[PDB]
Scaffold this active site. Structure first.
Site, mmCIF file in Angstrom:
data_model
loop_
_atom_site.group_PDB
_atom_site.id
_atom_site.type_symbol
_atom_site.label_atom_id
_atom_site.label_comp_id
_atom_site.label_asym_id
_atom_site.label_seq_id
_atom_site.Cartn_x
_atom_site.Cartn_y
_atom_site.Cartn_z
ATOM 1 N N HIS A 91 0.792 -1.224 0.000
ATOM 2 C CA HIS A 91 0.000 0.000 0.000
ATOM 3 C C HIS A 91 0.827 1.279 0.000
ATOM 4 C CE1 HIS A 91 -2.851 -3.013 1.776
ATOM 5 N NE2 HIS A 91 -3.659 -2.434 0.903
HETATM 6 S S1 FES Z 1 1.563 -1.063 3.985
HETATM 7 FE FE1 FES Z 1 -0.296 -2.108 3.471
HETATM 8 S S2 FES Z 1 0.543 -4.014 4.159
HETATM 9 FE FE2 FES Z 1 2.427 -2.981 4.617
#
Ligand code: FES
Ligand code: HEC
Ligand code: HEC
Ligand code: HEC
Ligand code: HEC
Ligand code: HEC
Ligand code: HEC
Ligand code: FES
Lengths: 181, 423, 235, 423, 235, 181
Positions: free
Chosen positions: F146
């Site tokens: 993400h």
């Molecule tokens: S930032 Fe979404 S899982 Fe590590």
């Protein structure tokens, strides 16, 4: 036309349905990895002639047992009469009579037969493994699944098993080896 | 008559907006307040037992499948992972394994209750057909399941009960190979069996759906040769709460005994040899497949051309009908004739509580069943062969000839009227 | 008499000193040929059986054979999480993980270990490489001892296992006469543990369930007797 | 009106002895000759598509399970055994994998058809509820299934879509561990998922049972805000053969396209990284779970306290409602509000073919769905964050506020009478 | 131009001479580091790809490394039924069984093998032990070649594989200029085979099904047009 | 009595049902074979300080990375302000501020901290594995699931990930070893 068009649509639907169904019944067949079904080189290599020798192949055992004189004479003294299966199931030769001369085995690349006998250790009734080492009421093999008595040369006796113990195609490798396949 | 009492959805606004999906109408009008006679003994409970046992098996299996790994190299290990590490483990496995036993025990009493009180007689043929279909499905299921642990008895039971299909000529080996996934047994067979074993129970539930739909449309048999007299029926109390509570009481007792077994005598009905891993190279003594297939195993391994009543020497007229095929046909027929019964009993009468000769023959039949159960485990050596032959012959004789003769000359009894039997 | 064990009944949660003695016996005698792969070592701390001290378990584990790995082929230190080793062939025997169920079970082991007496007065010469047992039934028999139709006249048969113990093979730390019989009983109990570790939980569940279901059944019987009262009162 | 035409069982003796089990009565009277309007466009076919696709998936799966081995060390190998050795192999797998895609594509058109022609409006609430329940079940199913190949995307998709349940406070880690079978992903998770994945489809079929029962009791929606005028109904031709044949024609076309895909563009909808075995030690770039979950993935990873419309800084009033929990609630609400719709649209009107403002807002909604689909794949870097926030906000706005305002001031249209629209 | 292969389209059933050439290269070059466990040795006779002579397959199999056993630990003869070997570590690379799908696939391999030119004029020194590739995108880059925010200014990156071939590494028995480009194309096709052996069957099934379903759909359209005729004639 | 008896039967049925249901929900919990969750000895053994070291444990990776001066100075020059998680997740010590002096690691059995840092390579967002080797917009780790940017010492920055990279309980084995557990 009413009849022609309707019936033809039905026929086409049926044909497509069948063409879709067949593979759902074909996938359960033997796959290519089972298609292989090849040979095995078992080395007799002095295993103390007279007791037994078993090896795995094709998922079934292949019995290689030397001969004990008493076992031999009991064999050679069996007239074709009173012999359930007199076909000599061995596939290395034609349907010649189930005789010990033809039924024992090839002759080491030499000339002798009353010393070795390698058959498929699979009861012809339903595929169980008979117990060896001189057992049963005929000095041979005994099937514990339903009680089928085999003889010295492997011909079926005293039980439901219809035929004797088959003999796969095998030849010798010059006095110390066996070729199964 | 047949008062459904739909409830008219007059309760309140909730029971009025439910006019979108009828569901509660169905339950109430039909599957709860189903008029059942008063004359019911303790033999009309085993259906509830079977339904509960089926639910139990399905649940426990869905749980086990979270830890069972279908493969020759990891099945035994997974079963031990279950019985040791998992929290509940032994419970699920013992409840699954033994509950199959209870299932079949309960269907046996369910079926023999039926043969007595003319439940196969018209107008209750569809129920009988569906029940035999089920019996077949559940036998096949239990068979597929006994294989999964990949013990020693698994392998050989599968071997023989698949060599059967290969006995027949022309299309035997092909079917055998198409069923085992190959020439002999291996992981492919295991995968097939697991899938299949994890799928049929739902078919059984649906078939149970039709089983329950049928005998709700067709009235429950009742101890007598009488109906609920639809034309208002002071007899025929409803199902809920009376018979629900009666059945639940019996079911509590049965589960009590079942759990006592599970906790003190769990390995009793089993075969110890199924606790040693498999060796395709060595066969143990007395495979003895199981206890709910011994009757047919014996009917199979009886005909061997070893008696003066040996019809195999006569069936050899046709060179194709050998012994093996004859036994297989004999077993399939042992079941097909039980299915055909309702069209063999040529009697315009009902429950054998008013047919004495039928009582005697029926108790002889129960004894024959028990004997066959006890014989499939013992060798084929004298005298057991004669016993098995006699028993199979009597089974077939009963179901083929005995019932017609009775239906002809079997009415020395005063039938009871007024299913309201206030005695 | 029959020398019943502790667990032989509706109670008897595996007297643990007996199991510790059986463990002293199994690791020092039977382990030379036999194995128990179906048995994790950490189970020697789980309740029900030998509730040994974990540290001793890790020590005893590291002191065993080397179980290499599953990801990177390399002889590791054999952590407790692994399973007991496996002796497979060349003069070795089967696995004793569940041998207490593949046969009343433990009584077989007791009356088997018990009994290796000399060859009887039918074949005193015996056999070379095979030794005699009075209870094993799946062994060979000489033709001199068989009857007219192949059945053996001996109680047992010839087993490939030698006598495992003498008069005083090992010492017990707790203090106890370590004769052959006590060792046999102890090791039988240990194997029964290795096979059925969750026995006591079984029994307790059975008790609880019997009780609760008897209660439920009684209450349902009362409810039935009540509901069916106005229809079974005049007769 | 609502002519059932039970057929009176007057055909012959066969149709008269079938008075034991009604079954054919049901089929004929209800599920074949169900009066359906004439005004049906090509949007009322996708239910047949969904039923057929479900059957297809169930069948292909029952076949695959005969060769798939649930275990970390033998799953990939079994999948390759399938695609290489088995006779049909690739076909079953590609048909299973892609058919899921068609399934979800078809439900999307099934659902959006509904939102337009007021199929959620009364008296069709139960159908809507059941449909949302199904949608949930089938999403969970597809998720459990994408894991079984034990590729690389499997592992990490599972990881994150299980860390969700752990985000919540107090009961997050417990649920996470109880679902994964442990702290992290391993064979236990695989077994759970396989079992579960091999069980829910039947629940779906039953729910489809109730789905079909409902809209047979409640009339099929029609392009117009009108009913079949029960009081005799020259309109409302029957289902068989007319609409059966129409739907089958459309279904043939759809299967044609589907097989063309399977045979020429099969690996198009997939992720190549799922063809490399798993490494718990290395994560690939752009996991991109799938294409039928990107909307909710984006609604989740949008709220991050990175915009002036960031309501997370305000929700931080309560120290428990952090960002993660906020996104999870936002997703669950994105679905719950779609389920609540029928009680939010305060309009005594029907199909938006007579509500213009609704048409505009609805096409904006379709565009929003497509945009969310396209955004869940692109990083969280500017400008995509603003886009995702706008789209989620519009979704919620539509379903919460827009429909009431319309129901208030949205009747500048002449509604059509006489569902017999002979134009 | 793009040097499209044969199978790139609705047809193109894997020209087999190309695959035999790719095999001559794979076993003599790539096999030194790479493996293909997901590939049985008996597939070199199955139709669709290299329909070699079985006997040569058994010979080539016995001439490979020793895959020991699954039941009895003992170095066997590496029978064809087994799978290709596996090179795992210590200067070795991944498995090429399905590398043609884990990336338009084969074009990646072609344009990867193609391209190992010298280090550019931003970091001519390069790196010790790492070599430069025009198309690999998952490798390290020196700080001298990165932009202000970590992104690389090079087309590709540094791969741990060395240049696999020179100007004329091997001879073709059929007779063909064995330059680097032809070898790259051939080996790419061989790997695509190893990954998708059942391609041609795929295409033939697709054709058959498209045809049958078009027929069924046409017939259903006629039936529909007919049934719905008396209701769509006046308008 | 009517009420008492009926309601009591219902209550007993409910109790038994629940006692039967609970284990169906208990079996899915971590089994004893998962209960173990013990320790691992990783040997630093001269892996060329400054690049990285990863080892499997508990099913998750344990990052052991030496320190590069530029990485260090960037670390030590981070005031607690503008730091998302200032708790120093490391469980080998109390909730002391997320400072590099406390956040790097024990001192080899000696006295120094700005040279080694072993943390749990598991993103706190949803458990992905961030990419190391100097990545992201802060010269540390980057999560590709993400987009969460970690810093040199592992404290979370620039993303949804709420907290930094935890630090398990670990002590040294006299200058060449690490004890994880
Ligand atoms: S930032 Fe979404 S899982 Fe590590
Ligand atoms: C090798 C020196 C052994 C040691 C020490 C022990 N056992 Fe053993 N055992 C061994 C063999 C080769 C066999 C097979 C015997 C045969 O004829 O096949 C066995 C067998 C057993 C059995 C199984 C008996 C049966 O009915 O099949 C048991 C229960 C058994 N052995 C127990 C046992 C115990 C408790 C030991 C330690 C006290 C022990 N054995 C030691 C080889 C050897
Ligand atoms: C050792 C001397 C090698 C030989 C000879 C060949 N390969 Fe290889 N390869 C090797 C390594 C150590 C790696 C990993 C590179 C890295 O930076 O991680 C590779 C990688 C590949 C790849 C994958 C590229 C990717 O994008 O990940 C391919 C497709 C590949 N190699 C192809 C290939 C071919 C066709 C070879 C024979 C002509 C060959 N390699 C030889 C090591 C070695
Ligand atoms: C959801 C899966 C599932 C369902 C449903 C199920 N079982 Fe099983 N069954 C299993 C598993 C897993 C095993 C192997 C583990 C075991 O033996 O306990 C098994 C094994 C068995 C065994 C052998 C038991 C043993 O320990 O050897 C029998 C007998 C059996 N099943 C019968 C049945 C019958 C009869 C039914 C229902 C009519 C049924 N099962 C329903 C999963 C299931
Ligand atoms: C081969 C026969 C057969 C089998 C097997 C069978 N049934 Fe029945 N069942 C019957 C008959 C006959 C009746 C009597 C119907 C009647 O009286 O109208 C019956 C009645 C019932 C009843 C209502 C009355 C009663 O006896 O309890 C239930 C409930 C029931 N069955 C459930 C089941 C379930 C559940 C199964 C299997 C899981 C099953 N049955 C298997 C034949 C069978
Ligand atoms: C009887 C078993 C079964 C049923 C029913 C079933 N599947 Fe599967 N599914 C499998 C198996 C086995 C796999 C793994 C093999 C594979 O990936 O093709 C799988 C894998 C999948 C995959 C991943 C495909 C891939 O290759 O990565 C998806 C997506 C999926 N299932 C979705 C579904 C959906 C959605 C349904 C129905 C609603 C469904 N499945 C019904 C057995 C089944
Ligand atoms: C979330 C909503 C939703 C989902 C998901 C859903 N349905 Fe429907 N379905 C509806 C609604 C609303 C209708 C319209 C009913 C009416 O017009 O009376 C409908 C109608 C139908 C119809 C009859 C008319 C038509 O549109 O074809 C069929 C058949 C049908 N659905 C099958 C299915 C099947 C099969 C599935 C899943 C496998 C499914 N549906 C999933 C809501 C849904
Ligand atoms: S199986 Fe060999 S005799 Fe019955």
């Amino acid at each position: 036309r009413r009849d022609f068009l309707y019936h033809a649509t039905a026929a086409t639907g049926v044909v497509v349905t069948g063409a879709a169904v067949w593979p759902l019944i074909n996938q359960m067949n033997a796959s290519a990895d089972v298609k292989a079904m090849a040979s095995i080189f078992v080395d007799v290599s002095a295993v103390e002639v007279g007791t037994q020798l078993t090896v795995k192949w094709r998922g079934k055992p292949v019995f290689i047992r030397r001969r004990d004189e008493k076992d031999i004479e009991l064999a050679r003294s069996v007239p074709l009469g009173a012999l359930r299966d007199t076909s000599a199931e061995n596939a290395n030769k034609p349907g010649a009579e189930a005789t010990d001369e033809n039924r024992t085995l090839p002759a080491f690349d030499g000339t002798n037969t009353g010393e070795w006998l390698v058959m498929l250790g699979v009861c012809t009734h339903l595929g169980c493994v008979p117990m060896g080492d001189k057992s049963g009421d005929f000095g041979g093999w005994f099937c514990p699944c339903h009680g089928s008595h085999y003889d010295s040369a492997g011909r079926i006796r005293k039980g439901p098993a219809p035929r004797n113990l088959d003999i796969p195609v095998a030849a010798f490798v010059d006095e110390t080896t066996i070729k199964l396949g | 008559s047949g008062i459904p009492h739909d409830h008219y959805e007059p309760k309140t606004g909730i029971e009025k907006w439910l006019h979108d999906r009828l569901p509660i109408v169905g339950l109430v009008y039909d599957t709860i307040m189903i008029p059942t006679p008063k004359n019911l003994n303790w033999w009309w409970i085993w259906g509830i037992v079977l339904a509960f046992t089926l639910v139990l098996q399905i649940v426990t299996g869905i749980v086990l499948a979270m830890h069972y790994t279908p493969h020759v190299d990891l099945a035994f290990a997974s079963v031990e992972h279950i019985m040791r590490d998992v929290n509940g483990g032994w419970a699920m496995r013992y409840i699954h394994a033994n509950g199959a036993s209870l299932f079949f025990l309960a269907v046996y009493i369910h079926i023999f209750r039926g043969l007595y009180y003319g439940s196969y007689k018209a107008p209750r043929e569809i129920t009988w057909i569906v029940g035999m279909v089920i019996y077949l499905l559940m036998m096949g299921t239990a068979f597929m399941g006994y294989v999964l642990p990949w013990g020693q008895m698994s392998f050989w039971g599968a071997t023989v009960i698949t060599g059967l299909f290969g006995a027949i000529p022309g299309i035997g080996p092909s079917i055998q190979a198409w069923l085992l996934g190959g020439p002999a047994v291996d992981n492919a067979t295991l995968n097939r069996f697991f899938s299949l074993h994890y799928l049929l129970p739902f078919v059984i539930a649906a078939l149970v759906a039709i089983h329950i739909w049928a005998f709700h449309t067709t009235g429950n048999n009742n101890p007598t040769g009488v109906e609920v007299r639809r034309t208002a029926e002071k007899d025929t109390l409803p199902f809920w709460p009376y018979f629900v509570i009666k059945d639940l009481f019996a079911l509590a007792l049965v589960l009590l005994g079942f759990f006592a077994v599970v906790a003190y005598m769990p390995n009793y009905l089993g075969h110890p040899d199924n606790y040693v891993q498999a060796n395709p190279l060595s066969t143990p003594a007395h495979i003895v497949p199981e206890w709910y297939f011994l009757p047919f195993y014996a009917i199979l391994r009886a005909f061997a051309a070893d008696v003066w009543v040996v019809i195999l020497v006569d069936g050899l007229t046709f060179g194709i009908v050998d012994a093996k095929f004859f036994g297989v046909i004999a077993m399939f027929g042992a079941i097909a004739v039980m299915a055909l019964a309702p069209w063999l009993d040529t009697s315009k009468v009902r429950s054998g509580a008013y047919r004495p000769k039928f009582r005697m023959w029926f108790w002889f039949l129960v004894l024959d069943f028990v004997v066959l159960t006890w014989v499939g485990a013992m060798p084929t050596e004298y005298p057991y062969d004669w016993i098995s032959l006699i028993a199979s012959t009597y089974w077939f004789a009963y179901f083929l000839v005995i019932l017609p003769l009775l239906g002809a000359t079997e009415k020395p009894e005063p039938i009871p009227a007024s299913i309201e039997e206030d005695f | 008499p029959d020398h019943a064990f502790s667990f032989e009944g509706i109670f008897g949660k595996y007297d643990q000193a007996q199991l510790r003695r059986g463990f002293q016996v199994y690791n020092e005698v039977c382990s030379a040929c036999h194995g128990m792969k179906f048995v994790p070592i950490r189970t020697l701390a789980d309740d029900g059986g030998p509730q040994l001290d974990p540290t001793f378990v890790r020590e005893y584990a590291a002191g065993l054979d080397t179980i290499i790995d599953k990801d990177s082929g390399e002889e590791r230190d054999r952590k407790e999480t692994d399973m007991f080793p496996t002796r497979v062939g060349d003069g070795m025997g089967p696995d004793l993980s569940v041998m207490a169920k593949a046969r009343g079970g433990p009584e077989y082991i007791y009356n088997y270990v018990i009994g290796f007496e000399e060859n009887p007065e039918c074949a005193p010469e015996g056999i070379d490489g095979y030794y005699y047992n009075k209870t094993f039934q799946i062994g060979g028999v000489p033709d001199t001892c068989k009857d007219a139709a192949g059945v053996k006249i001996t109680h047992g048969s010839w087993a490939r296992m030698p006598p495992p113990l003498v008069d005083d093979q090992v010492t017990y730390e707790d203090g106890t006469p370590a004769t052959v019989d006590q060792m046999a009983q102890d090791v039988s109990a240990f194997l029964m543990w290795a096979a059925e570790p969750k026995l006591v939980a079984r029994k307790q569940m059975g008790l609880v369930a019997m009780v609760m279901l008897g209660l439920l059944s009684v209450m349902l019987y009362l409810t039935n007797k009540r509901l069916w009262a106005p229809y079974k009162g005049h007769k």
